[PDB]
């Protein structure tokens, strides 16, 4: 059974790269901007769950309070599978990469139940 933190209108928005940084840490493509300084960042995401642990991912995105997209996580077509521990690795990656630029980062209440 699935979750919805993002509207399909907001699920489709593409975005630009200020200080583009992309990394593959597991079966995940993580996309980040470094030019953003000291601004509130909210993590919203839609995915599926199994035994209270994320089965699969659809999309993870970061907004400001004004509504600007910062970071993305996407599975790979070259690597489809992704067990929850790989997801946890991506989670830690995001927490670090965002608290580096001292950008305040909000976490929606769905995600922390699973990592």
């Amino acid at each position: 059974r699935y979750l919805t933190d993002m509207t399909i209108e907001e699920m489709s928005r593409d975005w630009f790269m200020l200080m583009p940084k992309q990394k593959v840490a597991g079966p995940l493509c993580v996309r980040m901007d470094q030019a953003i300084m000291d601004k509130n960042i909210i993590l919203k995401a839609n995915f599926s769950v199994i035994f209270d642990r994320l089965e699969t991912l659809t999309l993870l995105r970061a907004f400001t309070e004004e509504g600007a997209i910062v970071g993305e996580i996407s599975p790979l077509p070259s690597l489809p599978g992704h067990t929850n521990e790989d997801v946890k690795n991506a989670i830690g990656v995001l927490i670090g990469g965002l608290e580096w630029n001292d950008n305040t980062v909000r976490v929606s209440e769905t995600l922390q139940r699973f990592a």
Partner: protein, 339 residues
């Protein structure tokens, strides 16, 4: 087919309890989760059960409770390999199944079970009473706490409180540093004269009426001591008892010169001051010596000597009774030669 397993994961997740980590498979045929899919799941065939095991083996092998009630479980010859896959499993329910023989139970006695359900299975009818059945369950699992929802009282356990620990074996006892320096000093003097070769210098350390006697154990290397070994356990003759006793300082040191000349390891002496009064001081000394004359100058001996001494003017001490126990040294006594 593996996609059968893929769809099995769904209903396994629907029946997973996250507060208690419990999985229920109670009567899978009823309550139309199986009927809403037209799939029957037989827990007797090895393929289906191994696939079900694998799902958790990938997902949650830390399960706490498992329910396999009412699933036509005739025999578990192939599920005995469950103990190693989910070892945190503590509660197991096998009620209303077809467990025919207790012969199966010896194949899974490696679990760590706390609650078990085995009622409804016909094998429980095979015991006349409940005590034979419960003791046969203790035969396989004593770790259990509740059976068939019934709280079992902890078993009969009378700890006699029998003590068998021996205290720590400490070394030389003196008590006062004064008695330490004193008795070590006296041992040194006496055993210095004793190894000089002319032991006659012991006349001033012994009493005018100081007795002396020798002993060795019963079984040789200790042949030369036989003439003066004195054991009242073996020797009954009273006049021979008196004649084997050494009485006057004269006769004592004369007899003491009869023994082969020695060299004692005093740095490895063990001193026990038994009683100190105003009028006497008894103490035993445990040690080793090597002979240096005769045929057994390569043979090494161990001894337990007992001294009783009265105080004497000018801070001295006069031996009144002397008992020498002499044995050959153990191997480890030989190894710890000198310090």
């Amino acid at each position: 087919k593996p996609e059968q397993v893929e769809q099995l994961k769904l209903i396994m997740s629907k029946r997973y309890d996250g507060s208690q980590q419990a999985l229920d498979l109670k009567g899978l045929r009823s309550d139309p989760d199986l009927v809403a899919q037209n799939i029957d799941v037989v827990l007797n065939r090895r393929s289906c059960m191994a696939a079900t095991l694998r799902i958790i083996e990938e997902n949650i092998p830390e399960l706490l409770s498992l329910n396999l009630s009412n699933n036509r479980l005739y025999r578990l010859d192939d599920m005995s390999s469950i103990v190693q896959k989910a070892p945190n499993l503590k509660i197991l329910n096998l009620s209303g199944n077809e467990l025919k023989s207790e012969r199966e139970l010896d194949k899974i006695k490696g679990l760590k079970l706390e609650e078990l359900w085995l009622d409804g299975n016909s094998l429980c009818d095979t015991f006349r009473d409940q005590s034979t059945y419960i003791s046969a369950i203790r035969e396989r699992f004593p770790k259990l706490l509740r059976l068939d929802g019934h709280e079992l009282p902890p078993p009969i356990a009378f700890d006699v409180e029998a003590p068998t620990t021996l205290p720590p074996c400490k070394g030389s006892y003196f008590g006062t540093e004064n008695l330490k320096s004193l008795v070590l000093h006296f041992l040194q003097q006496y055993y210095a004269i004793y190894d000089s070769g002319d032991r006659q210098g012991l006349l001033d350390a012994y009493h005018d009426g100081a007795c002396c006697s020798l002993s060795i154990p019963f079984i040789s290397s200790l042949a030369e001591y036989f003439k003066d070994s004195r054991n009242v356990k073996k020797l009954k003759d009273p006049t021979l008892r008196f004649r084997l006793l050494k009485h006057t300082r004269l006769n004592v040191v004369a007899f003491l010169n009869e023994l082969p000349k020695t060299q004692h390891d005093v740095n490895s002496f063990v001193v026990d001051i038994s009683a100190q009064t105003s009028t006497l001081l008894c103490f035993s000394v445990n040690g080793v010596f090597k002979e240096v004359d005769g045929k057994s100058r390569d043979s090494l001996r161990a001894f337990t000597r007992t001294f009783i001494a009265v105080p004497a003017s000018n801070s001295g001490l006069c031996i009144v009774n002397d008992e020498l126990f002499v044995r050959n040294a153990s191997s480890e006594e030989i190894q710890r030669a000198f310090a």
